Amino acid sequence: GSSGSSGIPGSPFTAKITDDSRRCSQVKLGSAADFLLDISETDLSSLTASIKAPSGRDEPCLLKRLPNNHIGISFIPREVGEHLVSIKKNGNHVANSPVSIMVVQSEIGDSGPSSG
């Protein structure tokens, strides 16, 4: 979208969406995105946060406490595909771990509008 004088990005009249409602999740590559997962584990610190792209590229992940009695992880995915999140407790893998997440490029562009 277009931002400037403290103005939130909206949308024009005609539909120009660039992402189908496929049976997959969509995330913003190169930007810390939160993930809502149903886990029977409250303790945050007691848990561990680790991620490794499909190409073997480590990514900065950070676990935080979400509102409405929810909890999710927040990391900056660099590669798109099937990411595996290693979630354990004091060195003991937890349920639903490693957590699988699907990463896809929102818009076709290498770090925004910039020459090659």
Swiss-Prot record:
Filamin repeats lie at residues 28-103. ISGylation prevents ability to interact with the upstream activators of the JNK cascade and inhibits IFNA-induced JNK signaling. Ubiquitination by a SCF-like complex containing ASB2 isoform 1 leads to proteasomal degradation which promotes muscle differentiation. Ubiquitous. Isoform 1 and isoform 2 are expressed in placenta, bone marrow, brain, umbilical vein endothelial cells (HUVEC), retina and skeletal muscle. Isoform 1 is predominantly expressed in prostate, uterus, liver, thyroid, stomach, lymph node, small intestine, spleen, skeletal muscle, kidney, placenta, pancreas, heart, lung, platelets, endothelial cells, megakaryocytic and erythroleukemic cell lines. Isoform 2 is predominantly expressed in spinal cord, platelet and Daudi cells. It is linked to Interaction with FLNA may compensate for dysfunctional FLNA homodimer in the periventricular nodular heterotopia (PVNH) disorder. Atelosteogenesis 1: A lethal chondrodysplasia characterized by distal hypoplasia of the humeri and femurs, hypoplasia of the mid-thoracic spine, occasionally complete lack of ossification of single hand bones, and the finding in cartilage of multiple degenerated chondrocytes which are encapsulated in fibrous tissue. Connects cell membrane constituents to the actin cytoskeleton. May promote orthogonal branching of actin filaments and links actin filaments to membrane glycoproteins. Anchors various transmembrane proteins to the actin cytoskeleton. Interaction with FLNA may allow neuroblast migration from the ventricular zone into the cortical plate. Various interactions and localizations of isoforms affect myotube morphology and myogenesis. Isoform 6 accelerates muscle differentiation in vitro. Belongs to the filamin family. Homodimer. Interacts with MICALL2. Interacts with RFLNA and RFLNB. Isoform 1 interacts with FBLP1, FLNA, FLNC, GP1BA, INPPL1, ITGB1A, PSEN1 and PSEN2. Isoform 3 interacts with ITGB1A, ITGB1D, ITGB3 and ITGB6. Interacts with MYOT and MYOZ1. Interacts with HBV capsid protein. Interacts with ASB2 isoform 1; the interaction targets FLNB for proteasomal degradation. Comprised of a NH2-terminal actin-binding domain, 24 internally homologous repeats and two hinge regions. Repeat 24 and the second hinge domain are important for dimer formation. The first hinge region prevents binding to ITGA and ITGB subunits. This is Filamin-B. It comes from Homo sapiens. The chain holds residues 1899 to 2001 of 2602 of the full protein.
